[PDB]
Design a binder for these strands. Structure first.
Ligand SMILES: [Mg+2]
Lengths: 156, 201, 251, 50, 1319
DNA sequence: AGTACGTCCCGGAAGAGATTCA
DNA sequence: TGAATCTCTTCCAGCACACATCGGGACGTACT
RNA sequence: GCGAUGUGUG
């Protein structure tokens, strides 16, 4: 239900968000809640409510990313071992209907429209794990099974 | 203002100044009459547009899931993040169309300026409420968290001006009851702490 | 004997009336409701009262409201005193009848005794040092305590129906005590931290906000005015908008 | 910890008047712990000045 | 179409969803429960019947004798509700019981000697229930809450985390019966299964296993499957199963048919599994060392000498292998262990076992149960037999058995009450599977495991406890049984039963004090649901989630109505449409769904039943055909909302209302409000207080009508008919001939309870709301109750309110009110205080009830009668005297007006101990009630005769009519009225025999009631005569009350003010109340604004109609106008016409309107801005709902036009002149010479520990020293102080705190010396 | 007849087992 | 052999109000 | 003229 594999750039970005929050946004909201609580001190005061709620959320996320920075394992490998599509690969797949579909595969904690937004613990990935330029990949979605053809493998 | 007044002219003038502050305040406050009316909370025209776009995005991610591109976990996570982004967009929209909408001639043609919509007034004043509360009046009221400390995959579409559909209100219910209940136990343990401290010093 | 000393410490306690373990000497000492926590680190006190509170913003914050009936009942000693000073009743008993009848002269004497005699106010959740302050009453109709608005936030006390209690120093030294260390004047800053504690709040600040904010164009636009006096003059006349860009002389 | 420094204080009547009675009073009673006042809670109890 | 009465004020309503199932009878829980508790039901099935069939028959010590139940009856009570409340005794009822008492045929097979069935011996009395669902213990009207407790059954909890720090989850299981002893299982990080009975200690569960007379071998066979080693020619091949491999990774040789299939250093593949299973190869050679990590299953012995080689539960070694080999064995049973599928849990447990037999097992059990005492074989035998295997001291109800098996995936919905071997076994299996990962723990708070009891269950259970009390002494005295010279009542004593039930209904965390200070209050508090009480969790021990609300309270428990403060969630209010299942769970309604149609078929559901379906939320736009207009729709499936497909749904909401409480449903525009203030408003609305003049809340909801009707405060006509006699005291109605009885029905009489006492000292009163000669429909109101109008719920009043800060006087929430209000009295509440004066004949003599009190003045002498009592109706101020009582010696003992209360006296009751001379006024009031009851029964029989002769006349309309020969003779000369051969002659013969019958009957009734009132009712010991006096202040209003709307907008009315100074409008009217706008956004409850706007609309419609009427314009205009009015709106269920109304009718409707066209609104299907706007545009008010105003002071125009409308506000009980209170110098407590606490006791405040802290914090010292020494403790110094004051010498002398002196003497009482010293 | 007067009664934390590396 | 690590079991859980009910039964008698 | 339990207020 989890895999600590990480890409270097994503790890960099994680450190980046970590610093951005615990160094810039937390102190801003800090000053904010302080001035808001300059003896306002009202439970009903939904300003204080929402502010502390932003606090709760940012704290949950910082603890999450903290435990991540702890456990997460980086593999920033070269394009050296190629052919196999084990991980970190720009890949295109096609359908009977010709559904072109391109993406690079990265770690769970990198799923955003930023660079490349396909998991590794995903079923698609599990199929894509070890195949070659011309294999017949198959999966079993909760809607049933399906298949695709490999069309591209690229590294960086 | 008051504070510097103190630190620079001592005490007696400070206090007399404070009471004069209060007098003149209440006076011109009443004389003004800052009410609040329903029409005084503008629904952002683009709100319907944005939340519809968000709906379409949800559908896109749902297609990705059903096509097996993602597991329910990151499904959940993607959805929540995108709703949050949408929420922030809506907040920006409403704050703009409130704080600036007042646009009037000058003996020239036009110009924008800080508003007089009483609710934004009551906020920017700093009397009570802020961007946060005026948000939960005009825009969506974001997301609510089940007792698990988790967070539900379908946010509050509407706001307080419009009517909440039942399930929504029902959710936000426990959302708030959590803390409203918390405060009791909290008070208790706090008092115990206080007592202990007093009898160490 | 074990029961006598500490019922409930050795095996099954022995019960009393029907099923509830009877109190013991140990009980009479320890616990939330033993002698220590019940009657010594705090206790009930004469010369006091309590009511509900309201606002009455016409009060130089070195004072506060107080209910007439309530006062007259409070200071009865002082009343008897000034009474037989002026010699309107030989015996104390006669003066008791006097007060009960509530005759005219009584009220004047009451005002007299109050004029400069600070009293103490308290709220229930007496958290911190502010939690008790003092004032000089001014006698008011009705039956509630009028209370300066600013001091609310110090009391952490909205007007949702909160009850406040009043005490009255009986002795002279204590009158000095109040007037020296308990008269809100002498507390603009929480000993906790440096912030002021006389911060205005919602209404008054809404007021000032509306009171100082330019529009772009309104009655009396950009005229010129020597005296802020005459400014207020314009405003009361209505011959010129309240908030309006303007050049004025000031000092 | 406070919940201790309370107990082992020079005085006792304070402790006696804090968080529990029996432990403290007994240990005193065997200690013959003659006790001055030199303390708020103390004088408050005896009600003289502070 | 509508009822005639309804038409009087046809409340318009918004709303879209066609309501399909009306609101049920809101007292369902109470009435159903109690009715079920008491009825002669056959076949047992949960009643007194059930309790009996459980307890009886009681048998002797086989002493040829026995006693058994037969039947039982309940005689009509000895009083009625009303007079009962007046007097004080409970509203109990007799309990007759028929018992067959038999003695077996001694010295013979089982037979009989003689039997006796006692003539329904009565075993004391228990209460009935009010038709309105209350109880009456002691001159009061109390209620029983219903409890919500962990349902008996079996459960599986985590206790994740916080134990052992191991970062390892745990798993425990629990069985709790309905009446017995808890039984739990759990684990320790060493993975060891422990049982505990009733939380005493811990034991190795296998202990109780072996306790169930099992053999180690069987136990192992049960908890584990087999692994077979066959000792072949050699090499001892193992039997294998492929599925036994996927949870494995074997790194050694794995071969078959010669071929290796998993090499040494590999893992298992599902492909390996499939190949093998297709091959079906089980007998395979194995490495000899593989056995090393295995454990024997059965026992094996030396076949030659029968001698033991190895016992079960024993690991394996090569030496063991050789020894068993040479012995000659060939089959080896071992345990299929694992680290993911199956763990050695039971085995290692059995290892940890100290004992190895049934005997010492029972020994250890008895040792944990009764410590210290020596063991005894048969003793412990019987003990363990008396913990899970007997009717007496252990039982689940059917409820238990059901939920139990349902958890265990069993089949039979029914079963025994006792446990089984199989039961405990399967429980353990479930727990083990859970440990293994398959299966799921069950969160406690999921309502599917909470259960609702009710008064019924409570009474049943406690009455059972009473019977088990009695049976003990029953069998005791049966032991000494002699030959028939006795009767069962000799061998039975009601007194314990009575005592038990008495204590229950008197003192409980449930038998509490009804808040009859508002019809709405009653109807709420009769539905309150608590997790407190016996068997229920407790505040201090209360956890966290239990308080929180679970996603399945939905539509079964209000999410929002609950008091804040020292406890929340624990008092969950009960949902509106909710009901109680046969088995006793929160059952809720839903709408059945076909393929694609929302059929009107209602259908109830449990909690768990819901989870397996999918449910469509209420506000879902359907189209006339049961078809949703969408294809994806918001729904909920399992504690999770989502969007699902069209044809997936199963059931739909019933009505939007169905997810709040009455205590909430009455919150207009709830939807536009946060939960926090929503709650607080609901509560405060509960704390409402009636007024002098009910006034039909403008902006209502729709639930009101129902609330009023159910809450029996008002009076609904049983039958329907026509008004005959109205009177502010009573109302009497003729019935239509159809609904008449099959004969001789007559008419109906409704006595109206007039001004009298609440339970919160708040006037309760009734007022007729009909007129002479008027139709009434069955099931309709006749007289409004307190805070009710025209059969609708009216808590506060409507008022013209405006939002603008005004000279600060609304600083925080300081609601400012205008003298206009206090003019119209339109908050003038009415209170009543029940003051008691009694005497007791004691040493130094009895006492007096006379005016013979010396040392008084004519002031007191006057208002009292000559007989010693205040006259009815004296305006008495404080210090006055109501009754004259004296201490013979003979000082005063008078009962006097408690200080500070003004008011007047309405009535005086006087009870007296039978056997004392009734004084002059006693006789006077005696005769007063006498004559009044006589006149009452005279009304009864006289107008009964009136209806009787009118019915005879109605019979003589046809058939044998003799008009003149009928009216010449007086209306009684009718013994042989000449009639035809129809049944009308037989009818008149019926009425004539009834004439004579009723003559004698009324006679006996009169005389009986005479004796009733004449007797001197039993009372306390030594008491002489009760004289209760009622007073009635008219507390008006004054700065310091607590008003609020219905959205938490609390307020303390701050400064009343004169008409001038209020803001007003160009049209001219003043306004009435000013709230604070700066309170709106923060407490994010925008609703009150909407309410206000829609009101402004309402009163606009009003003023418009009022003008139209004052013009005396003819009807046509009114028709057009009101028709337009109701017609506006997008779509409504409220499509009313006007045409079918009569001219006279409509006019009356308008006249009821003129105060304002009342709009209601369903809780979520309610109206919207656009329709509000259009209603306004119908009126003549500005669209925005903001107007120019004018400060009377300034007499000029405010800027930024503001909001004025009508808000519906309420007053609370927290009246100032109750709260406000002071003390200078009064009483002093007796133990500690300290002041007293409270107001009633004329005591002072409490300077608290934290305040001591405070004053300490200030350098202020003399303050605190004075305020601990003088003001409280020293009597000596206190007096010195008071004197020195009277001489102005502001001074003090401390002395010593007498309380501390007391501490000293107390500790000194303890075995401790403590002293002061020198200086 | 029936009784008013008789006796008759969840977290912490620290201690004593008690268990395990020697 | 003895110093660590479980494990029963005593002690405390805010402040101030307001109001409400209820407070022994049982067993046995010298009379009332 | 005490204490228990409950309810409600902040
Ligand atoms: Mg408050």
């Amino acid at each position: 239900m989890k895999t600590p594999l990480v890409t270097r750039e994503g790890y960099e970005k994680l450190k980046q968000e970590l610093n951005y929050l615990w160094r810039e946004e937390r102190p801003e909201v800090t000053k904010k809640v302080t001035w808001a609580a300059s003896l306002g001190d009202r439970s009903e005061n939904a300003d204080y409510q929402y502010n502390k709620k932003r606090l709760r959320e940012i704290d949950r996320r910082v603890r999450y990313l903290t435990k991540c920075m702890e456990n997460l394992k980086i593999v920033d490998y070269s394009p050296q071992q190629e052919g196999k599509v084990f991980f970190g690969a720009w890949v295109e797949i096609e359908n009977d209907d010709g559904v072109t579909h391109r993406f690079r595969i990265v770690g769970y904690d990198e799923i955003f429209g930023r660079k490349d937004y396909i998991s590794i613990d995903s079923p698609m990935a599990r199929a894509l794990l070890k195949k070659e330029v011309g294999d017949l990949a198959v999966v079993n979605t909760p809607a049933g099974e399906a298949s695709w053809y490999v069309n591209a493998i690229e590294y960086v | 203002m008051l504070n510097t007044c103190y630190r620079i002219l001592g005490l007696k003038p400070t206090v007399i100044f404070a009471d004069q502050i209060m007098y003149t305040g209440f006076a011109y406050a009443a004389r003004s009459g800052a009410s609040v009316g329903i029409d005084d909370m503008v629904i952002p025209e683009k709100k319907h547009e944005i939340i519809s776009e968000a709906e379409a995005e949800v559908a896109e991610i749902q297609e990705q899931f059903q096509s097996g591109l993602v597991t329910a976990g990151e499904r959940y996570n993607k959805v929540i993040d995108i709703w949050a982004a949408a929420n922030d967009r809506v907040s920006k929209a409403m704050m703009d169309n409130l704080q600036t909408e007042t646009v009037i001639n000058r003996d020239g043609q036009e110009e924008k300026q800080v508003s007089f919509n009483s609710i934004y007034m009551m906020a920017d004043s700093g009397a009570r409420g802020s961007a946060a509360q005026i948000r939960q009046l005009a825009g969506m009221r974001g997301l609510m968290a089940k007792p698990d400390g988790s967070i539900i995959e379908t946010p509050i579409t509407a706001n307080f001006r419009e009517g909440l559909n039942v399930l929504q209100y029902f959710i936000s219910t426990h959302g708030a009851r959590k803390g409203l209940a918390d405060t009791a136990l909290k008070t208790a343990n706090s008092g115990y702490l206080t007592r202990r401290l007093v009898d160490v010093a | 004997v074990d029961a006598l000393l500490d019922n409930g410490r050795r095996g099954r306690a022995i019960t009393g009336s029907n099923k509830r373990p009877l109190k013991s000497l140990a009980d009479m000492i320890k616990g939330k409701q033993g002698r220590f926590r019940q009657n010594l680190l705090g206790k009930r006190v004469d010369y006091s009262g309590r009511s509900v509170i309201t606002v009455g913003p016409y009060l130089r914050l070195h004072q506060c409201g107080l209910p007439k009936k309530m006062a007259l009942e409070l200071f009865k000693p002082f009343i008897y005193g000034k009474l037989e000073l002026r010699g309107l009743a030989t015996t104390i008993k006669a003066a008791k009848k006097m007060v009960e009848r509530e005759e005219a002269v009584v009220w004047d004497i009451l005002d007299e005794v109050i004029r400069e005699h600070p009293v103490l106010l308290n709220r229930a959740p007496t958290l911190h040092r502010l939690g008790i302050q003092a004032f000089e009453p001014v006698l008011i109709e009705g039956k509630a305590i009028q209370l300066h608005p600013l001091v609310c936030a110090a009391y952490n006390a909205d007007f949702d129906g909160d009850q406040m209690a009043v005490h009255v120093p009986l002795t002279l030294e204590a009158q000095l005590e109040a007037r020296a260390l308990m008269m809100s004047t002498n507390n603009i800053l929480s000993p906790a931290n440096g912030e002021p504690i006389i911060v205005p709040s919602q209404d008054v600040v809404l007021g000032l906000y509306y009171m100082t904010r330019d529009c772009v164009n309104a009655k009396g636009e950009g005229m010129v005015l020597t005296g802020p006096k005459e400014a207020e003059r314009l405003y009361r006349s209505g011959l010129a908008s309240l908030h309006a860009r303007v050049k004025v002389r000031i000092t | 910890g406070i919940t201790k420094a309370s107990l082992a204080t020079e005085s006792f009547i304070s402790a006696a008047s804090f968080q529990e009675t029996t432990r403290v009073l007994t240990e005193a009673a065997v200690a013959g712990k003659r006790d001055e006042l030199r303390g708020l809670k103390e004088n408050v109890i005896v009600g003289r000045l502070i | 179409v509508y009822s005639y009465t309804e038409k009087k004020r046809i409340r318009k309503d918004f709303g879209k969803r066609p309501q399909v199932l009306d609101v049920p009878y809101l007292l369902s829980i109470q009435l159903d429960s109690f009715q079920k508790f008491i009825e002669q039901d056959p076949e047992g099935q949960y009643g007194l019947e059930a309790a009996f069939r459980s307890v009886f028959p009681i048998q002797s010590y086989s002493g040829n004798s026995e006693l058994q139940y037969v039947s039982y009856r309940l005689g009509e009570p000895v009083f009625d509700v009303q007079e009962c409340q007046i007097r004080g005794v409970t509203y109990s009822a007799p309990l007759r019981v028929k018992l067959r008492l038999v003695i077996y045929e001694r010295e013979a097979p089982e037979g009989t000697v003689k039997d006796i069935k006692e003539q329904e011996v009565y075993m004391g009395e228990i209460p009935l229930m009010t038709d309105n669902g209350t109880f009456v213990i002691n001159g009061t009207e109390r209620v029983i809450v219903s409890q919500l407790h962990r349902s008996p059954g079996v459960f599986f909890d985590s206790d994740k985390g916080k134990t052992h720090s191991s970062g390892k989850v745990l798993y425990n299981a629990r069985i709790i019966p309905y009446r017995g002893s808890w039984l739990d299982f759990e684990f320790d990080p060493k993975d060891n299964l422990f049982v505990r009975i009733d939380r005493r200690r811990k034991l190795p569960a296998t202990i109780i296993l072996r306790a169930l007379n099992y053999t180690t071998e069987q136990i192992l066979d049960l908890f584990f499957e087999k692994v077979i080693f066959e000792i072949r020619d050699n090499k001892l091949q193992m039997e294998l199963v492929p599925e036994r491999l996927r949870g494995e990774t074997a790194s050694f040789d794995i071969e078959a048919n010669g071929k290796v299939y998993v090499e040494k250093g590999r893992r298992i593949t599902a492909r390996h599994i499939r190949q093998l299973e297709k091959d079906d190869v089980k007998l395979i050679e194995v490495p000899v060392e593989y056995i090393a990590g295995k454990v024997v299953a059965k026992d094996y012995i030396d076949e030659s000498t029968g001698e033991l080689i190895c016992a079960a539960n024993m690991e394996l070694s090569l030496d063991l292998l050789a020894k068993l080999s040479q012995s000659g064995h060939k089959r080896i049973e071992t345990l299929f262990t694992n680290d993911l599928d199956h763990g050695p849990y039971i085995s290692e447990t059995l290892r940890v076992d100290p004992t190895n037999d049934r005997l010492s097992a029972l020994v250890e059990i008895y040792r944990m149960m009764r410590p210290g005492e020596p063991p005894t074989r048969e003793a412990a035998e019987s003990l363990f037999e008396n913990l899970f295997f007997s009717e007496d001291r252990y039982d689940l109800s059917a409820v238990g058995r059901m939920k139990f098996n349902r958890s265990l995936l069993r089949e039979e919905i029914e079963g025994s009450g006792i446990l089984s071997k199989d039961d405990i076994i399967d429980v353990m299996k479930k727990l083990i599977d859970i440990r293994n990962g398959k299966g799921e723990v069950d969160d406690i708070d999921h309502l599917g495991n909470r259960r609702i009891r009710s008064v019924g269950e409570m009474a049943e259970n406690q009455f059972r406890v009473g019977l088990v009390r009695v049976e003990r002494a029953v069998k005791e005295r049966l032991s000494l049984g002699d030959l028939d010279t006795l009767m069962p009542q000799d061998m039975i004593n009601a007194k314990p039963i009575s005592a038990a039930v008495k204590e229950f209904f008197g003192s409980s965390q449930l038998s509490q004090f009804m808040d009859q200070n508002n019809p709405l209050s009653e109807i709420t508090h009769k539905r309150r649901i608590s997790a407190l009480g016996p068997g229920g969790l407790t505040r201090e021990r209360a956890g966290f989630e239990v308080r929180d609300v679970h996603p399945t309270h939905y539509g079964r428990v209000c999410p929002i109505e609950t008091p804040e403060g020292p406890n929340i969630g624990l008092i969950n209010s009960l949902s509106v449409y909710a009901q109680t299942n046969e088995y006793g769970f929160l059952e809720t309604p839903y709408r059945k769904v076909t393929d694609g149609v929302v059929t009107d078929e209602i259908h109830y559901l449990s909690a768990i039943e819901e989870g397996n379906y999918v449910i469509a939320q209420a506000n879902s736009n359907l189209d006339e055909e049961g078809h949703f207009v969408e294809d994806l729709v918001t729904c909920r499936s399992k504690g999770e909302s989502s969007l699902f497909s069209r044809d997936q749904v199963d059931y739909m909401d019933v009505s939007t209302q169905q997810v709040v409480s009455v205590g909430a449903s009455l919150i207009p525009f709830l939807e536009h409000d946060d939960a926090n203030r929503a709650l607080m408003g609901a509560n405060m609305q509960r704390q409402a207080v009636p007024t002098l003049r009910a006034d039909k809340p403008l902006v209502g909801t729709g639930m009101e009508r129902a609330v009023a009707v159910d809450s029996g405060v008002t009076a609904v006509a049983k039958r329907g008919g026509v008004v005959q006699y109205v009177d502010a005291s009573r109302i009497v109605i003729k019935v239509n001939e159809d609904e008449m009885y099959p004969g001789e029905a007559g008419i109906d009489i409704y006595n109206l309870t007039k001004y009298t006492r609440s339970n919160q000292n708040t006037c309760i009163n009734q007022m007729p709301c009909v007129s002479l000669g008027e139709p009434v429909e069955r099931g309709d109101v006749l007289a409004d109750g307190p805070s009710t109008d025209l059969g609708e719920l009216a808590l506060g009043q409507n008022m013209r309110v405006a939002f603008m800060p005004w000279n600060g006087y609304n600083f925080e929430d300081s609601i400012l009110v205008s003298e206009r209000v206090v003019q119209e009295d339109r908050f003038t509440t009415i209170h009543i205080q029940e003051l008691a004066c009694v005497s007791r004949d004691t040493k130094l003599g009895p006492e007096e009830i006379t005016a013979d009190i010396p040392n008084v003045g004519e002031a007191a002498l006057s208002k009292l009668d000559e007989s010693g009592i205040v006259y009815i109706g004296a305006e008495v101020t404080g210090g006055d005297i109501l009754v004259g009582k004296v201490t013979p010696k003979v000082k005063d003992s008078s009962l006097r007006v408690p200080n500070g209360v003004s008011g007047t006296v309405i009535d005086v009751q006087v009870f007296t101990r039978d056997g004392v001379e009734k004084d002059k006024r006693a006789l006077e009031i005696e005769e007063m009630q006498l004559k009044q009851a006589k006149k009452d029964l005279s009304e009864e029989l006289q107008i009964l005769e009136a209806g009787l002769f009118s019915r005879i006349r109605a019979v003589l309309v046809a058939g044998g009519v003799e008009a003149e020969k009928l009216d010449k003779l007086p209306r009684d000369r009718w013994l042989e009225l000449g009639l035809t051969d129809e049944e009308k002659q037989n009818q008149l013969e019926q009425l004539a025999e009834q004439y004579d019958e009723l003559k004698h009957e009324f006679e006996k009734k009169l005389e009986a009631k005479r004796r009733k009132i004449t007797q001197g009712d039993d009372l306390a010991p030594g008491v002489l005569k009760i004289v209760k006096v009622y007073l009635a202040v008219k507390r008006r209003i004054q700065p310091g009350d607590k008003m609020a709307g219905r959205h938490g907008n609390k307020g303390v009315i701050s400064k009343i003010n004169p008409i001038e100074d209020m803001p007003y409008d160009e049209n001219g009217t003043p306004v009435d109340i000013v709230l604070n706008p700066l309170g709106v956004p923060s407490r994010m409850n925008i609703g009150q604004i909407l309410e206000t706007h829609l009101g402004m609309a309402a009163k606009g419609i009003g003023d418009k109609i009022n003008a139209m009427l004052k013009q005396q314009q003819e009807v046509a205009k009114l028709r057009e106008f009101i028709q337009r009015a109701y017609d506006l709106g997008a779509d409504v269920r409220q499509k009313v016409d006007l045409s079918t109304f009569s001219d006279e009718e409509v006019m009356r409707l308008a006249e009821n309107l003129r105060k304002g066209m009342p709009i209601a609104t369903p809780v979520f299907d309610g109206a919207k801005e656009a329709e509000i706007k259009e209603l306004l545009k119908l009126g003549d008010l500005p669209t925005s709902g903001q107007i120019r105003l004018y400060d009377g002071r300034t007499g000029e125009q405010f800027e930024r036009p503001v909001t004025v409308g009508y808000m519906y506000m309420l007053k609370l009980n927290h009246l100032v002149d109750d709260k406000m209170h002071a003390r200078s110098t009064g009483s002093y407590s007796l133990v500690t010479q300290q002041p007293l606490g409270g107001k009633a006791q004329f005591g002072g405040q409490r300077f608290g520990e934290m305040e001591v802290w405070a004053l300490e914090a200030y350098g202020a010292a003399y303050t605190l020293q004075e305020m601990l020494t003088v003001k409280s403790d020293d009597v000596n110094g206190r007096t010195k102080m008071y004197k020195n004051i009277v001489d102005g010498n502001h001074q003090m002398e401390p002395g010593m705190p007498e309380s501390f002196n007391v501490l000293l003497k107390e500790i000194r009482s303890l075995g401790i010396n403590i002293e002061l010293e020198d200086e």
